[PDB]
Motif scaffolding. Structure first.
Motif, PDB file in Angstrom:
ATOM      1  N   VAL A 118       0.834  -1.210   0.000  1.00 48.56           N
ATOM      2  CA  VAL A 118       0.000   0.000   0.000  1.00 48.56           C
ATOM      3  C   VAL A 118       0.873   1.266   0.000  1.00 48.56           C
ATOM      4  O   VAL A 118       0.572   2.270   0.702  1.00 48.56           O
ATOM      5  N   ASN A 136       2.699   7.811  -0.353  1.00 47.26           N
ATOM      6  CA  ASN A 136       1.903   7.694  -1.607  1.00 47.26           C
ATOM      7  C   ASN A 136       2.516   8.506  -2.750  1.00 47.26           C
ATOM      8  O   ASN A 136       1.892   8.713  -3.786  1.00 47.26           O
ATOM      9  N   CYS A 142      -4.376   8.241   6.168  1.00 47.37           N
ATOM     10  CA  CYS A 142      -5.121   8.006   4.920  1.00 47.37           C
ATOM     11  C   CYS A 142      -5.227   6.494   4.672  1.00 47.37           C
ATOM     12  O   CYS A 142      -6.320   6.001   4.213  1.00 47.37           O
ATOM     13  N   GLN A 143      -4.158   5.779   4.965  1.00 49.26           N
ATOM     14  CA  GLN A 143      -3.986   4.377   4.604  1.00 49.26           C
ATOM     15  C   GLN A 143      -3.657   3.626   5.901  1.00 49.26           C
ATOM     16  O   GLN A 143      -2.504   3.453   6.279  1.00 49.26           O
ATOM     17  N   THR A 165      -2.710   0.762   8.429  1.00 49.62           N
ATOM     18  CA  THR A 165      -1.945  -0.469   8.290  1.00 49.62           C
ATOM     19  C   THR A 165      -1.840  -1.219   9.623  1.00 49.62           C
ATOM     20  O   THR A 165      -1.426  -2.369   9.591  1.00 49.62           O
ATOM     21  N   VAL A 183      -4.407  -3.634   7.470  1.00 48.04           N
ATOM     22  CA  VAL A 183      -4.572  -2.814   6.302  1.00 48.04           C
ATOM     23  C   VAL A 183      -6.068  -2.650   6.016  1.00 48.04           C
ATOM     24  O   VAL A 183      -6.815  -3.634   5.995  1.00 48.04           O
ATOM     25  N   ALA A 225      -7.829   2.865   1.635  1.00 45.53           N
ATOM     26  CA  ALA A 225      -7.299   4.255   1.698  1.00 45.53           C
ATOM     27  C   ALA A 225      -8.409   5.293   1.535  1.00 45.53           C
ATOM     28  O   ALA A 225      -9.421   5.079   0.854  1.00 45.53           O
ATOM     29  N   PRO A 232      -6.329  11.865  -0.471  1.00 45.07           N
ATOM     30  CA  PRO A 232      -5.057  11.827   0.247  1.00 45.07           C
ATOM     31  C   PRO A 232      -4.301  13.152   0.249  1.00 45.07           C
ATOM     32  O   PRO A 232      -3.483  13.422   1.147  1.00 45.07           O
ATOM     33  N   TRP A 258       0.067   9.489   5.781  1.00 41.64           N
ATOM     34  CA  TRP A 258      -0.254   8.412   4.865  1.00 41.64           C
ATOM     35  C   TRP A 258      -0.583   7.171   5.719  1.00 41.64           C
ATOM     36  O   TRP A 258      -1.694   6.645   5.644  1.00 41.64           O
ATOM     37  N   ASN A 259       0.346   6.693   6.509  1.00 40.89           N
ATOM     38  CA  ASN A 259       0.149   5.580   7.424  1.00 40.89           C
ATOM     39  C   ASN A 259       0.340   6.077   8.865  1.00 40.89           C
ATOM     40  O   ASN A 259       0.190   7.274   9.117  1.00 40.89           O
ATOM     41  N   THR A 275       2.104  12.068   3.951  1.00 38.43           N
ATOM     42  CA  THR A 275       1.640  11.938   2.585  1.00 38.43           C
ATOM     43  C   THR A 275       2.550  12.647   1.596  1.00 38.43           C
ATOM     44  O   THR A 275       3.361  13.502   1.957  1.00 38.43           O
TER      45      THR A 275
END
Length: 287
Positions: free
Chosen positions: A47, A55, A244-245, A247, A251, A254, A258, A264-265, A270
């Motif tokens: 991801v 990302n 956003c994502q 994990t 997981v 998303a 974004p 991001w995680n 991001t």
């Protein structure tokens, strides 16, 4: 009143962790998996964008584009300030901490001098803290910060010893707002650690810069992030805290937007935040 911009940059050598890595953790973990190295995992995972822990491009990649520089990006996700990595299983194959990255850069010059015009970009320390917290490190945090600072200063000294003249060193990021740190209820510990590194490191680098006749710029990522997070709509950001994502623990799908997210995680920003960061880091230099 601002001072004169620094001279242009045509080559960057970058040293660091997941906040800079542009594919090395991915290359290296594929190599380790192929060799059957015990405990190896494919990093960063599925991801992520093209092997970056994000990302999109990391801040140093954006910096190089802004300055019209080529980038040699030695950073490895998980890298500590010393020899090794958050991922302990890597040490049997390669020393991927900042010190190990410096060793491998100096050992692969192939009889050429260090380029005295190249910018040596250093962005590391977060994994010193994450390893300490995740695996019950012994050191008090103030001692851990002292070791981080020492290690970074030693890396600049060793690069300078070999011929490097130009540096950009990034401060600790704001570990206290990292979602994993919030979820671990470790905000105060992060605050203490990052304040200690950020107070001491620029003092040590300014002494070394004068001693060895270096050009050494200090980038205060903490001031940068605090400005972004106090005025998010100015930058088109909406969500400052949720990844956003996701994990961890697993997981999940998303977010759709974004570019309006900070993280991001649970650890890494991001592409949008990396873009603003790289632009900010470019601000001291002429194109």
């Amino acid at each position: 009143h601002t001072s004169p911009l620094l001279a242009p940059v045509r080559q960057i050598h970058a040293f660091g962790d997941s906040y800079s890595d542009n594919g090395e953790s991915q290359r290296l973990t594929r190599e380790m998996l192929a060799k059957g190295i015990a405990g190896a995992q494919a990093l960063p995972g599925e991801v992520y964008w093209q092997g970056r822990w994000s990302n999109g491009p990391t801040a140093v990649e954006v910096l190089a584009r802004q300055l019209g520089a080529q980038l040699a990006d030695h950073a490895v996700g998980g890298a500590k300030s010393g020899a090794d990595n958050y991922y302990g299983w890597m040490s049997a194959y390669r020393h991927t901490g900042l010190a190990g990255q410096v060793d491998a850069y100096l050992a692969t010059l192939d009889g050429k001098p260090v380029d005295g015009q190249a910018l040596h970009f250093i962005f590391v320390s977060a994994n010193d803290f994450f390893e300490h917290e995740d695996f019950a490190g012994e050191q008090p945090l103030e001692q851990l910060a002292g070791s981080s600072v020492a290690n970074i200063r030693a890396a600049v000294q060793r690069l300078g010893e070999a011929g490097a003249r130009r540096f950009l060193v990034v401060s600790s990021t704001d570990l206290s707002v990292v979602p994993a740190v919030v979820a671990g209820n470790r905000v105060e510990r992060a605050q203490r650690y990052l304040q200690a590194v950020n107070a001491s490191l620029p003092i040590q680098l300014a002494a070394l810069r004068k001693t060895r006749g270096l050009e050494l710029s200090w980038f205060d990522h903490l001031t940068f992030s605090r400005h972004l997070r106090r005025n998010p709509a100015r930058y088109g950001l909406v969500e400052l805290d949720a990844p956003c994502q996701p994990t961890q623990p697993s997981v999940r799908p998303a977010c759709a937007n974004p570019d309006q997210y900070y993280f991001w995680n649970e650890w890494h920003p991001t592409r949008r935040v990396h873009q603003l960061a790289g632009e900010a880091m470019a601000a001291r230099y002429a194109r």
